[PDB]
Structure 1
Amino acid sequence: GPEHWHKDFPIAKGERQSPVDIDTHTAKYDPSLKPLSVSYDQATSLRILNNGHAFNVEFDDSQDKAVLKGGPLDGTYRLIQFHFHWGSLDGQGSEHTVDKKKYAAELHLVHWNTKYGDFGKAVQQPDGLAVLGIFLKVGSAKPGLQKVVDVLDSIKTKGKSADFTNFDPRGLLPESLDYWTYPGSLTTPPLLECVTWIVLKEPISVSSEQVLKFRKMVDNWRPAQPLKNRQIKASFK
């Protein structure tokens, strides 16, 4: 596991690895950051599948039917999938941290830069993927989330999948798209340094009834990585 990733994947000791802690004092507000555009009105989900590390909802990236522009990014990024990381106890579970503070879970909406013509060729570049990072606090319910948790048992174990259509990812957004952003990597192997992270300040809510159905596979995240030379910029003053 994570301590012995550097064996098979030596990018793991790299100068741009993710996730990172976000000490808010140093995270200086950049006003050249345009604001965050999200066109998901024609997002076409295909499958939900437990891959024996987490569960991924797959999307149709055949054309610009669900795209991410603005923020720090040059061009159009296509939604390809989203998946979660989550813990055992609930004061642990998120990949990223804020002043060392940790959420129950983190939701990662993954997009790839159409400059490069598919995910395969995108993952090979520094500006290849843009990953939209959203925290989960446990609290008020999430109707957006409810359509997911429902079907979690028709994929109990590693390898099982399902049809999963007309899922609307905009149900997973918070009311504030204020964000920190830094250059980083996949949090899981192959840990490729091909990612412009977009971590949102505002978490969403999920009910206790929702986090328990997500286990009935725990602590499936990765420790804070060294920030090295990198600046974290912030969209909010």
Structure 2
Amino acid sequence: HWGYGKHNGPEHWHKDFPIAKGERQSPVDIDTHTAKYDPSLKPLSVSYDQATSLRILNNGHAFNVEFDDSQDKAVLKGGPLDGTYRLIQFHFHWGSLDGQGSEHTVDKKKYAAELHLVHWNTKYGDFGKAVQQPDGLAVLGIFLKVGSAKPGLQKVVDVLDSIKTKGKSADFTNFDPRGLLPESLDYWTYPGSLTTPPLLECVTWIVLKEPISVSSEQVLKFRKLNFNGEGEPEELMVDNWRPAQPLKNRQIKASFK
């Protein structure tokens, strides 16, 4: 199956997922000089005060922190979005060293990692139906740079030893995702895709301009995870990012003047 190595990685995905060469693939490079302020964007609303986290899972590609999406609790609305988008999970992409790991780039700069908070449009009723729609998903992307520790990330870091290998999960209740945000909600937005197979072109991307800082020790613990299952030869879970794809017939809009 698909993965990130030289034999099953991003350059191979198109053979089983031909949309990999499609017209609105993600991630992209964000050329900050070409991005334009868009006065039609409404204020962005990140409303996570009632979020209900449930579980953390090593899925063999990354780890997902999963939420109760059975009602409207943690949601995203406003900005480029029509209506209501429920939070279902977050995960990260990261590198083998600090100089790479992000999926989006900023004037070709690669960050050490990138956080994706994944939401689905409730008008469509379930995630599977949402991924049959052009406007089914909204992903809030946040860059990570290495510097001071992020206190709101430490609970995630410390549970990773219990989910080292593919298929392991652990309870992860009472986690507040608000602790993963930066101060500013300035953002860039464009229409794109899932960044892993099946690469479906359903996503409104909202990428925050301000990175969060995490410590070297925090990201080093991400890099101790394994792609493989228990008992199998160890393959460190690193470099689980797709490189930037062609922008094609798109424009990146900015929320700020």
TM over 0.5: yes
Deviates more, 1:172-181 or 1:208-217: 208-217
CA distance in 1: counterparts of 2:246 and 2:24, whole angstroms = 8
Q: 1:213 aligns with which of 199, 221, 227?
A: 221
Paired position in structure 2 for 1:149: 157
* Structure 2 gap ranges (5+): 1-8, 225-236
List per-residue Cα deviations over 1:41-100 (Å, max 9, x = no partner). 110011100000000001000101111010100000000000000001111100000000
Deviates more, 1:209-218 or 1:173-182: 209-218
CA distance in 2: counterparts of 1:213 and 1:55, whole angstroms = 12
* Structure 1 gap ranges (5+): none
List per-residue Cα deviations over 1:100-139 (Å, max 9, x = no partner). 0010000000000011001010011010000000000111
CA distance in 1: counterparts of 2:47 and 2:209, whole angstroms = 20
**Count of residue pairs brought into register by the alignment:** 237
3-state SS, counterpart of residue 105 of structure 2: coil
CA distance in 1: counterparts of 2:91 and 2:194, whole angstroms = 12
Offset, 1:39: 1.2
1:236 aligns with 2:256: yes
TM-score, normalization by structure 2:
0.91
TM-score, normalization by structure 1:
0.99
CA distance in 1: counterparts of 2:175 and 2:19, whole angstroms = 34
Q: What is the RMSD computed on CA atoms of the aligned residues?
A: 0.6
Deviates more, 1:30-39 or 1:191-200: 30-39
CA distance in 2: counterparts of 1:134 and 1:170, whole angstroms = 12
Deviates more, 1:212-221 or 1:196-205: 212-221
Offset, 1:209: 1.1
Deviates more, 1:27-36 or 1:44-53: 27-36
Offset, 1:172: 0.6
CA distance in 2: counterparts of 1:91 and 1:39, whole angstroms = 32
Offset, 1:27: 0.5
Offset, 1:140: 1.0
Percent identity over paired residues: 100
3-state SS, counterpart of residue 6 of structure 1: helix
CA distance in 2: counterparts of 1:22 and 1:39, whole angstroms = 26
Offset, 1:228: 0.2
CA distance in 2: counterparts of 1:135 and 1:29, whole angstroms = 20
